[PDB]
Amino acid sequence: AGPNSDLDVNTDIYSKVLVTAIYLALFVVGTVGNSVTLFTLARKKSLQSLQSTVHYHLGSLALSDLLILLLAMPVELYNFIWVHHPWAFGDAGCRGYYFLRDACTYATALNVASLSVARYLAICHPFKAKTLMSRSRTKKFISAIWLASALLAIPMLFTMGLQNRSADGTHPGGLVCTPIVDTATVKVVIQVNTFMSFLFPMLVISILNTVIANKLTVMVPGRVQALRHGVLVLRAVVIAFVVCWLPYHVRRLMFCYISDEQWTTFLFDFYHYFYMLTNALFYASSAINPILYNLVSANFRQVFLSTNIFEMLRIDEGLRLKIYKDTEGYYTIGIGHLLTKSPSLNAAKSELDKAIGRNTNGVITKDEAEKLFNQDVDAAVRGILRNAKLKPVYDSLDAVRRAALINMVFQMGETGVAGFTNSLRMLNNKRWDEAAVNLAKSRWYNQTPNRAKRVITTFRTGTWDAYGSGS
Template sequence: MEELSLLSNNTPSINMSDYERPPISREGPIFPEYIKIVSTLFCSLVLVVGVIGNILVPLVIFKNRDMRNSTNYFLINLSLADLLVLLICLPSVLVELHTPPDTWVLGHAMCKLVPYVEVSVVHASALSLVVISLERYHVICRPLQAGYRCTKSRAITAVFIIWILALLSASPLLVLSEYQVIRFLDGTLNPNCITVMETLWSKCYFVSITVLFFFVPLLLLIGIYTVISRQLLIDTYDLTHNQDNPQMKARRQVVVMLATVVLFFFLCLMPMKVFYLWILAVPTETVATLGLEAFFNLLYFCRVMHYINSSINPILYNMTSTKFRTSFLKVFTRKRGNLHREDTYSNTSYNNQTVTNKIRLQYSTSYSMVYKTVCSETHVSHQNSYKSTGSSSSQITKQSFLTSRYDCPSATESFV
C-alpha cells in the first residue's frame, strides 16, 4: 500500500517505496520527459523575471523620495519575501526535475529549510496584503480618524510583527519534514525528503494553516475591497462630479493596483492549496488511481503557479501604476539630467535669457481631498539663483516654493 506524504518542497506526492521498480530503470519510476522540459523552461523564466523585478522594486522606491511611504514599505516586504522563495525554493525544484523521482540530493539542512521558507513566505505575504488593504481602507473610508495613521515607523513595526507570526506559524514544519535514506525493493538506496501526514495533529495543522492564512484572508480582503470600491464611487459622485478628477484617479489607481496583486496572489496559490486539501480528504487509493503521469502533471502545474506568484508582482505594478511605470523607466533610461519632479512646472522662453519657474506643492495631485482642503492656506517664499553659462548670455532661474503653515501629512504618505 502506498504511503501518502509531502515530497521535498512540501508538495504532495506518493511515496514509491513499496513499488517494484520498472526493470528498465533502477533509479525509480519513469518521469515524463515533456513535463521535465516544460517545467524547466517555465521555472527558469519565472526565476530570471522574478529576481530582476523584485530587486528593482526596492531600488525604484528608495531612489524616488516621493515613493518612500508606508504602503510602499509593505510592497518592499513582499518583494523581499518573493526573493526568498525564488532564490531558495525554486532552485530546489529545478534540481528535483533533473534527478530521479522520490530522490532528494540537497541534504538534510535544505530538506528542513525549503518547506519552512516556502510556507513562512506565503503566510507573511497574506498578512502583508491584509495590513496594506486595511491601511487603504482607513485612508479612503475613514479619512477623519486622525488618531490612525500608518506612518513609516508603524509600517516597519508591522513588518516585524508579520514575520514573527509567519515564522512561528510555519515552525512545526521543521519537525514534520524528515530526511531519510530509503531502501527500495530493487535494493537501491535513495535519500528522501518528506513531510508525512500520518498523525491527526499533523493533518489538523495543515488544514488550520490553510484556513487561517489563505481562506480567511481571502474572504476578509474581498470584503475590504468591496467597501473601498463603494466608497470610491460615492466620493467620485458626491465630492467631484467629475470622473477625471486627478485626486480620484490616483486613489482609484492605487486601489486597482493592490486589488490586482491580491487577486493574482490567491489565483496562483489556489491550485496548490486545493491540491493539499484533496490529498488529505481522499483515500490514498484514490490518489494512486490518477497514475504517475497525471499526478506529476498536477503536481508541477501547481508548483509553477505557486512560483509565478513570486515573480508577477513587479509586472502588475508596472501595468496598473503610472508612478511605478515611470520610475521603472527612469532606472533604465538614466536620463536624469533633464528630468524634473512630477509636481514641477516649467515655462521657458528661448532667447538670450532663459527663465524657469518651478512650483513645488506641499501636496501632489494624488493627495487626499480632505487633507488638501486643510492644507490650502500657504505662504510664498522666493529664492533667486543666477547661474552663468558658457555663452555670453546668462541663465536666470527663479524658484517659488509654496509651503504649508500647517503640519499636514505629506502626499507621499497617502498614495503609491
C-alpha cells in the same frame, strides 16, 4: 525494476522542459522585478506618512516574493521536477527547505493582507489613520509579521523529515524528503497552513479591496485617470491571488486527504503533472506582484521601462485660488470652500489664514485647495451617514447617483438636503423622472439653475451625460 522503481515519476521529457523554460522565465522576470522594485522604492523618499507606509508594506512584499523565488525554486527544479529520488539535501536540508518556503509564503500572505488593511484605514478612517500609524509604528508592524511568519513555520521543522521508502530496507537511491508523522497530525498541520495562508487573507483582501474600490470609485477626466486604474488594479489583485494560490492549496490537501486504498497509477501520475501546473502558477504570483501592485504609479511606469464627486464638483464649483464671492454673495475660495458669511473681507481673510495656518493674504496654492476640498467632502459624507433621512437614500444608490447626492450636500449641507423629503423618497424608490420633475421646482433650482440641472440629469440617468465639460 529495482528497489527504487516505485519512486519513479513518469512525466514526459516534453512537459519537463516546457515547465523548466516557463519556470526560468518567471525566475528572471520575477527576480528583476522585485529587485528593481526594492531599488526604486528606496530612492523615492516621499514626504507624506500615509504614502510612505504603503511604500514600506510594498517593500516587504517585494522581498518575500524575491525570497520565494530564490529559496523555493532552485531545489524544487532539481529535486521535485527532474530528479524525484533520491532527495539530495539531507535531513536538515529537508527540514530547512519547508521551514523557509512556508515562512516566505506566510510573510507574503500576511503582507498582502496587512497592506489591504492599511489602505482601508487610510481611506475609510482617515482621522484614526494618521493617529494610528506613522513611520515607526508600521516599521514595527512589518517586523511583527516576519516573526509571526517564522513562528507559524516552526511545525514544518518537526513534521517534515528524511526517510527511506525503498522496497529494500534502505538503499541510498530510496531516500526522500516527505512528511514523516501520523497522517492525523499531517492533516491538521496542512489545514492550518491552508487556513492561515489562504482562507484568512482571502477574506481580508476580498472584502476590504471591494470596499476600497467602491469607495474610491465614488470619491473620484485625464486628471484622475490614474485613480480609476488603481480601482481596476484592486479588483485584479484579488483575482490574481485566487487563481495563482488556490490550485496550490488544493494540491497539498489532495496529498493528505486521499487515502492509500484510493491511490492508483492514474492519480499518482495525474498528481505530479498537476504539481507542475500548480507550482508554475504559485511562482507567477511572485513575478506579477511587483508589476501589478506598482503599474499605476507615476514614475514606476517609466522605471521598469528603464530597465466621481471630485470630477463633478471640479466642474460645478470651479477652482479659484484667490478669494471670490459665491452665487449668494459670500466669500469663498478654492473648490467651493465657504470661508464665512460675514460681509467683512478681513473676516474672510482671517478665517482663511486660520484654515491653513499661513499668512496667505487671500491667495492659496493648488495643493492647498485640494487639501481643503478633501476635508469638505469628508465632512459631507459623514453628514449623510449620520443622518436618519439621508443614509438610507445614499445606501440605495449606484456610484454615480451617490456622488450627485454628495454634490447637493456639499453645496447646501446635511440639514439643507434633508428638507427635500419627497424628492428623497422618490430617489430611494427609483422614481427618477418624478424626482427630477420635483427637484426642478425648488428654490435651489432657481438660485443656481445650470448646476442644479446637471445634478438633476445625473439623478434621472445615472450617466455622465451632463458632464462633457469634465477633464
